[PDB]
């Protein structure tokens with residue numbers, strides 16, 4: 001394309017040049033001979049047929065191996081004009097290796113985005129490409145998918161075009177495992193709308209800073225990613241009737257609060273703890289009494305304290321500035337540092353047994369003094385209330401003396417709760433900005449849940465995020481395959497139902513329903529003498545041999561102990577039950593929480609102002625609230641693919657990519673676009689939009705039924721009359737026909753305006 005000059009230096013990474021296009025069309029190729037054949041180490045390899053034995057085929061691979069395969073299992077290659085094409089729905093042969101090798105060949109030229117009919121696939125580059133500069137934001141503005149190469153800016157503007165045209169709320173549903181590119185692609189959508197609203201500022205910059213401010217406190221280094229978002233996020237970008245940006249809401253779903261006090265080896269705590277320390281920043285290490293290196297503050301010192309990909313000194317100032325731009329006042333910004341400083345000291349407190357009483361006493365009090373000073377508490381009351389809490393059972397009060405191991409747990413639970421409530425506060429404080437009281441009518445909702453994880457030790461939080469991913473997959477499955485085909489039968493289109501097999505309700509019912517895994521947790525936390533082995537027994541008794549997705553654990557040697565295994569969509573996940581009743585119930589020491597309410601630090605008193613509704617129950621209802629509100633939107637999906645486990649750029653592993661293409665239903669999602677009628681318009685809206693293509697077809701002032709007008713109009717265009725169908729109230733278009741009708745509309749808008757201009761000369 002000669003128009004690629006508007007994309008500047010980004011152009012080689014968005015489209016192949018015409019110099020490369022002429023090489024593609026001049027490849028040696030025989031349509032009868034060039035085929036894909038399966039292989040073990042890499043899922044499919046290109047091959048050339050050398051002989052035929054009826055239903056058996058034998059072929060020579062790209063790597064010179066001989067192979068023999070059955071005729072149902074060998075799949076024709078696309079001819080070389082379909083090299084690296086931008087939308088895989090337009091291929092002539094559509095199958096697994098056609099999608100695999102089209103993505104691999106685009107990614108090998110660093111064209112990381114590809115369309116898949118109605119949705120887009122993103123393959124993670126471990127290299128910052130220049131395709132995201134604000135000249136490319138300008139270059140994507142108002143271009144259609146028929147024009148511009150695929151990009152996250154294309155999806156953003158396409159959703160924005162639907163929002164204004166349909167007058168319907170839109171959503172961008174970004175999906176993928178951990179390490180896939182979900183968070184930066186979220187940021188680019190947020191960058192796109194902000195810069196477009198700047199090209200038209202304070203709200204535009206603040207919306208951009210809202211991400212790195214939350215990343216300091218909400219992201220952490222994990223084995224799959226150095227910047228894993230330990231919280232799910234939904235961003236509603238709000239627009240007015242004229243389409244200009246008007247507000248944003250951030251909502252966050254479930255922070256991994258156990259990370260605050262516990263980390264596995266080979267992973268970090270949250271970035272905030274290490275970035276304060278690693279700059280050795282003179283003001284913060286004196287104000288927070290945290291003078292040391294990180295290996296002595298117990299809560300953060302386990303795991304890894306340094307990561308090569310992150311220069312914590314520069315990331316500190318980036319997020320310190322982020323809170324400045326978001327208008328956190330000096331006392332607020334200092335206070336939220338103070339609580340992170342206190343939490344570091346709060347894990348160093350030492351307790352010992354009193355010599356006869358089976359009761360804890362403080363062993364060392366210097367680190368409690370530091371904690372109480374920063375938290376504005378009284379240190380004597382803190383240590384007393386931590387060891388000897390008052391508990392009440394109606395009007396009866398009694399002191400229960402804590403043992404040394406369970407006062408340590410009480411310090412852990414309090415440290416988690418301060419951090420969680422401070423992170424929740426910070427979100428509400430970011431949403432105190434960004435709400436600008438400008439009027440709004442529509443939103444585009446960008447979702448970036450915590451992606452799917454399989455660790456060497458999976459716990460209750462890994463269950464919550466993997467459940468959240470499975471629900472969002474079933475949202476895709478229901479929208480693409482069930483709700484789509486219901487509308488064909490509802491409108492009376494000649495359609496016979498196709499079973500794609502993409503259904504997950506058996507595994508969601510195993511978790512959600514009132515006898516499922518989480519429903520056992522909400523009652524087993526209520527019985528005071530229940531235990532984790534009592535839970536595991538009741539869990540197995542209800543589900544082992546009664547749900548196909550609930551299996552016995554497969555403990556391989558060397559890996560830790562796991563107590564059951566779930567057959568999730570993205571893979572089998574083995575879960576350890578220890579602590580789940582405590583984690584679900586979340587009992588805080590009410591005496592020390594009473595000290596927190598009386599804190600001199602204005603933040604800490606606010607966090608615990610106002611403190612049956614277990615965290616699994618809250619999660620399930622927040623997630624069910626989300627997807628009911630999400631069904632009231634037009635969804636755009638972005639499939640983020642991690643190509644490679646080792647994080648090395650441009651390297652791509654075919655089994656790991658194919659696993660993600662299969663379980664995300666990518667091939668099926670294209671097939672319903674090719675087979676079905678993916679575009680459709682009400683006859684009233686069709687007449688409203690496209691009468692300009694042939695104004696003589698539908699003469700107005702006479703009454704005409706909307707169905708009767710549209711049926712006449714569509715025959716006169718000289719588009720293919722087989723590419724559309726008529727329903728009771730909608731016309732239904734095949735894959736490419738709306739893209740053709742829009743191009744026909746824009747050239748006819750261009751023709752009429754230039755002739756209006758010609759008349760504006762003709763009057764002179």
Ligand SMILES: Nc1ncnc2c1ncn2[C@@H]1O[C@H](COP(=O)(O)OP(=O)(O)O)[C@@H](O)[C@H]1O
Nearest residue numbers: 124125127128178179180181182183184225227
């Ligand atoms: N589009 C991209 N361009 C450049 N680097 C990327 C891109 N997508 C991902 N990466 C690399 O992968 C890292 C992790 O991606 P991220 O979005 O944080 O993962 P997740 O999908 O788990 O949210 C990024 O910080 C960066 O190093």
Ligand SMILES: CC(C)n1c(=O)cc(N[C@@H](C)c2ccccc2)[nH]c1=O
Nearest residue numbers: 161162165166678679680681685689
């Ligand atoms: C995704 C699909 C179901 N669809 C369409 O196929 C057309 C829609 N509306 C028309 C009026 C339109 C045409 C061109 C650009 C934007 C919107 N809406 C839609 O929702």
Ligand SMILES: [Mg+2]
Nearest residue numbers: 182183228229
């Ligand atoms: Mg993330």
